[PDB]
Symmetry: D2
Subunit: 501 residues, 4 copies
């Protein structure tokens, strides 16, 4: 198809796409490997906030008791989160705090979730929980100052509409939990932004009921959160993998758009919507995450997601993750943009490529976005999602582009099934679970995008680009003005160099 | 032609090719840019020695006088070589010291060489020159230890057979300068290895006569040094460039082979031969240095030069160079393997590819070298040197390589006119002289070798590679055992992932 | 009194004292904090080996069971020890491997030890344990090379004579565990050094019985391991401390001596003796560890312990530890040489000071060690251990040292109750449990030794040092050659500078 | 002297004292050593601007001709200043540009200044000099953008009232050069701040005459610049030293104040005054720079200089400097805050101490400055400048400070003749010209300030500090609130640790 790019544009592409990114549990942030991947992510994409589970779980170790004279008394150990949040602020990223799970010494029952056994029961004593929240938020303000902590966000719990994350999926108990948390947070400082309900899909009446619980009972709410995946239940499991079919990306966009409509009808029509988890599959052992398809699929969501929501947070930035035990191989289906040994997966490159876009929107359809940057240069990202099996399945794109600058330097970066894909080459190596240093460096070189460059002289103030994208390709194309300095090199003749003309 | 690679090899490919590398003047080693380049060269190519001019020239500033009690007395200022030689040893490289040029306060005349004005006249007092040599050598021993300094090499002066480097190209004055320096060095310690005569090509009788001089007067000598280039004097000039025609690589190898024979017919038949400079062109402003042709040309030399000499030192590791003034553009025909902003030029990847070869030499002709490493893997560099003008001129090559290892992972890296080639992309950018940071990063990215990988199974203990090499391509092919772990992934099926089979 | 230092010494002070250092459990090696601590320790102290628990425990996560073709089969996950052992080797340290504790899926019972719950029961199947040992040692050889792995050591289990560490303190069942482990290690490669019984003090008949067991059933043993502490059982507890009284250092040296003699009477008289754990207190929450007293105590051990044993491993290099939960304040009584935030405790300086000592032992008594270095310089460590309460309690020492110089430069470094002691300043700060960054930097600053320097000219070939050591001071004195260059500064007069003479 | 420090102050202590710092010539900024020093200075004292000579001198290399056809034509080589200014900005410092000296290819005559021979003659053609300024200023805008370059400052020449720096000290010829330069800069962009006349002391009529010339003839001026020193001509020289008597600090402040009054009476009454160089001695080989006296002298200036001027630029940040050849010894009387090897001099610590001061001024006299900061802590810098000879000469200072905070933590840092003084210890080592790495590390350690800390309890709402300062001491005293956490450590008893009470 032939697309004619207009010279200027009315609308502005937002940075909503990189507002937030997900993570494995906060206690894993103590790992050097974790910080390795986070530094890479902050250099090449730079997210504003980071969101995961386990702030209050026992590895991070904040809530204890502590026998004094003859009675159990609370003790708040900030050793670990002080280091964790410090390490975050040093990398220019703030916590999108999630309060959870339940500390053991505060839990009412035995039910846990994950390999790491986060306790998912309500607190035995709601006043002890309140006091925990006040202690934690108060500490954060003591350490980092009120101005800093006022920029953070505070979600209460996680997926209370699923039985695995909250006892009996108890709607009313969660609302009580929400109100105690919300009010405890405001009691420390009224500007702090608290929100919920952090639910998985399939049950959006919870968002209607949540916002009505808060209206009726005058309970604070500053944002709404929901999670969004497109995978069905596993159709085949091995001992290490879940395999799942996926709905197309418009299904996710519809989810975003549907939840925003439910907010617009509610008694709090102005509330921000934060999609605090999203990916194709919701399982950390689904190999789909390691593929070019995942990138081409996510590219579509990056292009449009921000039209409906204030943020959507890719779960996750890193394979440093233990919800289903320690990764059993290098490419093991983890959620991360970044694989162990800081090896970028195809999806990472899609973010990177979006990070080259300018604020000015020239054109956008279901397979491309075209922008103008301040300097006058064009930056476009194009993608060829093909969810069906088969080879070939190429897509041609004909881009007529307005530009006054008489010559143009075009730099294209590509990742697809052949290039920027460490997963493909890892198969060639024999799928080493625990590869050598040298196999890993080779995987790191191969994981880099394939670059091609050209110079093109304009005809009639317009350039034509013929772009062939192969199956599940995502590509960045930057088009810059050539200020040719050749004529300053007086006498220059390449033909005077052996072999050249 | 079909190349049958034997499974075993008797001969051993020596590491002579990276004994020593060349540099711009030692005062330039104080620059941060210099040290960035050397760090990159030492990580990707481990050179043992580094050889350049200007140890005794005035920017380094060792030789001074100094009015004390009505008398002009020597002062030896080691502030700068201390720092320089320290930085060398920290990067695991030792100085192939070159004694020169003439300190101004000790010069007999006015004649200089280069924009930096190295003085090229005899010492006004030969006893003060000797005292200089003794104080410097002694200083090295006091600072670093006798054992360390004893592993160094000491070449005396530079190209005395050229009027530009030595007043009148005075043979007997040079032999005298050599003699005073050689005895000065030995008087500090008899195991310090001293040599000469450091001549350019064109007059090899100087080697014959030099050794007859040392024989008659029993002047200590421990190696013969010589420089070797294949460029004719320039046939065109701009304010910016010297352009030169080149003879083929066989011309240089014959120069090596000629000088070795001359040492064998002499009264010191066993002397080591160090070619302390080599490249295609001897001009630091000949663009040929920046091209893929240079890379293929030199790969020929890296493959065989060690057959005839103990070392051959590429002039130079880096464009940090001022013989013909500060560089006037990013790619300005400088000698270096690395360009400003630490951008590898194509020749750098030739050195890097040779660094991947094993000790065991399995096969070699005029266009390839195939080797076996200690772990049984195969490693070959192939080049397609085309000096003639024109397009295409591709060379197909057929390989029959034995490996009992029944499946194989092949990693190929290529640098040619299209890949690994910053120069090409600089030109497409309009030859920016002083590029932006953004342009430099793109040129760095494009400067990386293109990588192709495949898996292949052996039929009958053997693999057959059909390889295509474009114009002036150099390429590294590594062939590793696949230890396939796929069977341990029970129930793995890529066809259960969206879009894959 | 007065000490006449002899100019020459017969004896050598051995490097035994820094052969090995202890660590918190291996899974903690994944922390950034841990690795910052190791780097500091490896730069300032030369440790060769690193010994700790948890290798086979479930955080590191090697042993898993996995359902394949309808049976429970072993899966060995090397993801984490690959990264751990990689990071050890990159910092020039190798594992003193300790095979333990019991993986949960292989345990025969439910008894655990520590906050992190390592299982302390026998394996439910000894053949599976064996296959576990074999798979781990084989994986090491595969990744690191057989020559690398042969330099390691392999301890079997931990304190099997203590009921907390091993079911019933079952002697005969530990011997069985040793045999199955030792024969499995030898089956992989016969050079691999294996030993035990890794007992705590109080029941040294276990060494005699362990060696008689290995003699009678021809079981491979390459060393005897043993733990040494001087602390009585805690006489007071708070919710975060154990306080304990200590025996003097001679008690530890006698423990070393008495165990060595037991080896020499047994059927393996020549076997190496590795004290794989030692410190004053055996509790990771006894504040004595954070004090100048600890450093004074342990310096006496460093000075003599090598006389009796091949190695004695200070438990531990770092407060990065979790046996009794996450540290509840900055200085919490941890074992570490280094405190969180890379703050060196006084004991760390004791090790640093011993790292400056020379080979040649000139003199030693129970309060000093005086040595000569290869360059002729003198290095001495002195300590004033004072276990009794009160102020003052100084030791005046007089040293008559010979030197072959004529003028000398004396650099003294000191750590005591006032200087190089962050615990004291932490107290002055109000004992902040979770100090700010600003406070931490102040604590690091103040943690640095105090330095005093002087020049002193000899008389009659000799130097008379008067030295005052304060309560529990450890101090380094280096006496070096002055090569006065003042005479080359002709006309120099500090009296011409404003205010000076 | 008993000082009662008020609770609140009406005035602000300005940041003018670290607005700018001086440097050796801009070409030396290419040195790794230089950037090591700049980084350190920028980490501990964050200066905003850096001011030095030689931008247009031929080592940096900007101006060349360049034979084309048969005519000499201008070529502007931006290779080196691009690297220099990039490195400045990456370290958060901007150029206070000084246009000079004269490029040889533009020079009218052959007179030069310094070891490095900057040419101090007018341009042969003022149109060529204009075309140079336009090319340089324009290139700066092209690379860094117009907003950034407008924050810089542009001074014309150096000390044109001194015959050494400018042919004949020709007043009218400098005004002509100012006019051509100023108009040139303004023709690129009118908001660029240009000024002069950069004079040395002893003839302040030049400032009057400059400003009248600019008013009458409507030449752009945006600031006045002037240099200030207090050293008399040398009374003794050696081959390597100038020794000079110093006027007291009142003389410098009186210089500042005098020039400010001349501007206030001029036709441009409101012009900023920048003192573009200042120190005690004006000679780069006067040992006084290396001393504690220099530090105590400069502190009075840092305390008050900002009263009269908009900036005052300490000449220099670093001993990396070649005006009078390469440093002949480690401490050689160089201008730098930082000695070679990154060793801080006593004067460096003065600046670091001032960098801890708060904005709100509580109390100031001629020997101390006392401030409050945002968090409520008190920071004070005290100094005891003694310019006469003699030992002892201690100053007792009694501070009576208000705090209701219950108790306080006092951190004191001292640099004087005994502590923080590497010069003193370098002499003890026998004044090594070219010390070993090991002697250098010792001088670094010894160069760190001496720290003392204490907790003091508030009696009656007031803390009474008694501070004995030794001769030529400068010292920082921070007083913070103790939030005591001791009572949360229930049961804590240091008396339960061996030896402690
Ligand atoms: Ca040079
Ligand atoms: Ca532990
Ligand atoms: Ca200079």
């Amino acid at each position: 198809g032939v697309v004619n790019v207009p010279s200027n544009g009315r609308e502005k592409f937002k940075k909503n796409w990189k507002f937030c990114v997900g993570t494995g549990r906060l206690g894993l942030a103590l790992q050097k490997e974790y910080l390795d991947h986070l530094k890479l992510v902050q250099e090449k994409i730079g997210f504003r906030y980071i969101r995961g589970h386990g702030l209050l779980s026992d590895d991070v170790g904040i809530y204890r008791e502590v026998e004094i004279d003859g009675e159990m008394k609370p003790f708040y150990n900030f050793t670990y989160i002080d280091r964790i949040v410090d390490s975050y602020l040093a990398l220019n990223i703030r916590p999108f705090i999630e309060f959870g799970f339940m500390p053991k010494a505060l839990a009412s029952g035995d039910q846990t979730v994950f390999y790491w056994k986060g306790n998912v029961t309500p607190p035995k004593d709601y006043n002890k929980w309140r006091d925990l929240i006040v202690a934690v938020v108060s500490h954060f303000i003591e350490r980092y100052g009120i101005e800093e902590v006022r920029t953070w966000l505070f979600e209460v719990w996680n997926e209370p509409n699923l039985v695995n994350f909250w006892k009996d999926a108890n709607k009313q108990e969660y609302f009580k939990l929400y109100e105690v948390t919300a009010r405890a947070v405001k009691s420390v400082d009224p500007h702090l932004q608290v929100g919920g309900p952090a639910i998985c899909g399939g049950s959006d009446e919870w968002i209607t009921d949540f916002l009505h619980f808060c209206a009726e009972r005058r309970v604070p709410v500053d944002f709404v959160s929901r999670h969004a995946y497109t995978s069905k239940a596993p159709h085949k499991k091995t001992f290490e993998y879940y395999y799942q079919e996926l709905e197309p990306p418009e299904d996710m966009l519809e989810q975003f758009k549907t939840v925003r409509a439910l907010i617009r009808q509610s008694p709090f029509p102005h509330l921000p919507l934060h999609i605090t988890e999203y990916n194709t599959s919701y399982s950390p052992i689904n190999p789909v995450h390691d593929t070019a398809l995942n990138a081409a699929y996510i590219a579509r969501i990056l292009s449009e997601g921000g039209d409906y929501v204030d943020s959507f947070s890719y779960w996750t930035f890193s394979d440093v993750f233990e919800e289903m035990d320690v990764p059993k191989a290098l490419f093991h289906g983890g959620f991360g943009l970044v694989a162990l040994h800081s090896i970028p997966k195809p999806t990472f490159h899609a973010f990177t490529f979006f990070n080259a876009l300018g604020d000015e929107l020239l054109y956008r359809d279901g397979e491309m976005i075209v922008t103008r940057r301040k300097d006058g240069s064009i930056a476009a990202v194009l993608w060829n999602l093909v969810m069906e099996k088969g080879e070939g399945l190429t897509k041609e794109v004909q881009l007529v582009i307005p530009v006054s600058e008489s010559a143009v330097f075009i730099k294209r970066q590509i990742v697809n099934e052949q290039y920027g894909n460490a997963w493909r080459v890892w198969k060639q190596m024999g799928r080493p679970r625990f590869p050598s240093r040298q196999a890993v460096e080779t995987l790191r070189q191969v994981a880099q995008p394939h670059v091609m460059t050209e110079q093109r002289r304009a005809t009639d103030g317009v350039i034509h680009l013929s772009i062939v994208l192969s199956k599940n390709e995502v590509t960045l194309i930057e088009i810059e003005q050539v200020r040719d300095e050749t004529s300053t090199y007086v006498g220059l003749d390449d033909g005077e160099i052996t072999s050249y003309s």
